[PDB]
Amino acid sequence: QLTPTFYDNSCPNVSNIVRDTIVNELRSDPRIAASILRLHFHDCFVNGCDASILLDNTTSFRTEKDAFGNANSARGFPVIDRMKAAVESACPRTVSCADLLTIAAQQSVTLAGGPSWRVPLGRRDSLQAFLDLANANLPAPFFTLPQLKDSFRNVGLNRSSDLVALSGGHTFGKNQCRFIMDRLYNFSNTGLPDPTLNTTYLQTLRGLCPLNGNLSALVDFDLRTPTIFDNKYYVNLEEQKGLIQSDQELFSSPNATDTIPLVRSFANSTQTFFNAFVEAMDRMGNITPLTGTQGQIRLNCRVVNS
Numbered sequence: 001q002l003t004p005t006f007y008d009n010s011c012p013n014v015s016n017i018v019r020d021t022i023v024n025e026l027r028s029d030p031r032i033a034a035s036i037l038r039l040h041f042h043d044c045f046v047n048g049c050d051a052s053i054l055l056d057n058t059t060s061f062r063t064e065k066d067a068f069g070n071a072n073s074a075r076g077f078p079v080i081d082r083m084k085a086a087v088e089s090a091c092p093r094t095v096s097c098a099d100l101l102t103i104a105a106q107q108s109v110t111l112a113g114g115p116s117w118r119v120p121l122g123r124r125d126s127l128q129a130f131l132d133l134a135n136a137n138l139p140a141p142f143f144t145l146p147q148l149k150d151s152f153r154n155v156g157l158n159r160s161s162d163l164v165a166l167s168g169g170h171t172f173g174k175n176q177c178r179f180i181m182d183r184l185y186n187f188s189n190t191g192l193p194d195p196t197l198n199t200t201y202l203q204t205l206r207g208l209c210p211l212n213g214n215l216s217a218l219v220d221f222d223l224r225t226p227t228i229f230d231n232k233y234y235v236n237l238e239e240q241k242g243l244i245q246s247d248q249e250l251f252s253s254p255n256a257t258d259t260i261p262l263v264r265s266f267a268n269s270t271q272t273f274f275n276a277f278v279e280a281m282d283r284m285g286n287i288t289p290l291t292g293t294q295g296q297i298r299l300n301c302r303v304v305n306s
């Protein structure tokens, strides 16, 4: 069983070391908090939160970094190496990369203005990476609501609250133009924009992402508070201003009978959202972890110990 007090004796200052690292990085890169939270999400959705995503290529297995959901998208790996080194110095061979990334995700949310809580700990590190599983398990922005629900259920999160609350991670961070081009100019081969996208916002997004333009150009997920972790993400959905298809479907999909009330509830109360986010985050952080003597305490998050 994972427990929040796992390192209270072996490495009491682990959380503080992680926090300090993120604080320093944020000065030069205000996007790092969002990036780190996303890394934890992509870790947990593939064989569980086992730091499998942090592993680099080997001649026996490919890195998840080349998955369709990670390539030229996932970022912040050097920052993780930095805090890991700092933690190894303070507490040699004690904190697993999987736990480190979980704490980093929680601290990132808090630093961005979100809720503060102690995450369950005790996870251990994987002995391999899973590229095929990542391509199969990571959801895509073009998924319909039923597909989004299927993706979450596939990894163990059955609750619509899990999906709606965790999608709140899009209250900050960046998104490439490439992922919304269809919504802007030709959605579902209709030759028309996605009707669920607010027409005023459509104009703005088209100006940021012109047809035949730079597909790698970045746009803010939350037009209200781009770098602050708050419930504004849901207020946007209510006004048809969710950035990607998967965002707006939580409120506009024909299958959203169960998610609409959750979206409204989170838009109406920050407390309601924050409570749900912590609950969902801990549930996601509890997906098939390696514990006890299973796996290892990786010294270099990029490679399995030898």
Ligand code: HEM
Pocket (backbone or CB within 6 Å): 031, 033, 034, 035, 036, 037, 038, 041, 072, 073, 074, 075, 139, 140, 141, 142, 143, 148, 166, 167, 168, 169, 170, 172, 173, 174, 175, 176, 179, 244, 246
């Ligand atoms: C429900 C399905 C989800 C889909 C389809 C999805 C899709 C995406 C896409 C397309 C991007 C843009 C990547 C890029 O342009 O490079 C992204 C970014 C991001 N996502 Fe999600 N996401 C989902 C769920 C989540 C969850 C559960 C979290 C965390 C709790 C999360 C946190 C983030 C963050 C913070 C970013 C910004 C990262 C950065 O700026 O570096 N996402 N997501």
Ligand SMILES: [Ca+2]
Pocket (backbone or CB within 6 Å): 042, 043, 044, 045, 046, 047, 048, 049, 050, 051, 052, 053
């Ligand atoms: Ca993983």
Ligand SMILES: [Ca+2]
Pocket (backbone or CB within 6 Å): 171, 172, 222, 224, 225, 226, 227, 228, 229, 230, 231, 232, 233
């Ligand atoms: Ca925000």
